[PDB]
Design a protein around this nucleic acid. Structure first.
Length: 138
DNA sequence: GGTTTCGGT
């Protein structure tokens, strides 16, 4: 089943709804920073004090980086945009070299994992809790 | 696989 982002932990498969705060494409992979406006002690604490940043998102540990490889890259790169809502299913989590919780989509995985990411229509009621919680940090 | 919260490709 789904979990709130505050509820996920390292080294488990999980699924969640989220809003896409930031994207970044490179020759290597496609990266998303997404939030559901819940806090996880393992997320990177985003600083409001950075001179020069376009971060349209919440500050503190409210956002998780997702690294998309291969087909996931090819699919999402010119498709998933900042502001979009996404639903991610059976994705993997780990801890990076700095000890932050991070999400990864490798290739090719396998049919049995049913790992996926797909845009959610912004008018879907499943995104209601995200929208309301967003109002706690505005 | 990759490096570290920018850049804005």
């Amino acid at each position: 089943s789904f979990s709130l982002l505050s509820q996920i932990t390292p080294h488990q498969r999980c699924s969640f709804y989220a809003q896409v705060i930031k994207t970044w494409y490179s020759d290597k992979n496609f990266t998303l920073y997404v939030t559901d406006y819940t806090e996880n002690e393992l997320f990177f604490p985003m600083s409001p004090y950075t001179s020069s940043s376009r971060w349209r998102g919440p500050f503190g540990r409210f956002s998780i980086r997702c690294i998309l490889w291969d087909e996931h890259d090819f699919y999402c790169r010119n498709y998933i945009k900042e502001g979009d809502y996404v639903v991610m299913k059976n994705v993997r989590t780990k801890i990076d070299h700095l000890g932050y919780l991070e999400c990864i989509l490798h290739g090719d995985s396998a049919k049995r994992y049913n790992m996926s990411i797909e845009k959610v229509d912004s008018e879907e009621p499943e995104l209601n809790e995200i929208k309301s919680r967003k109002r706690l940090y505005v």
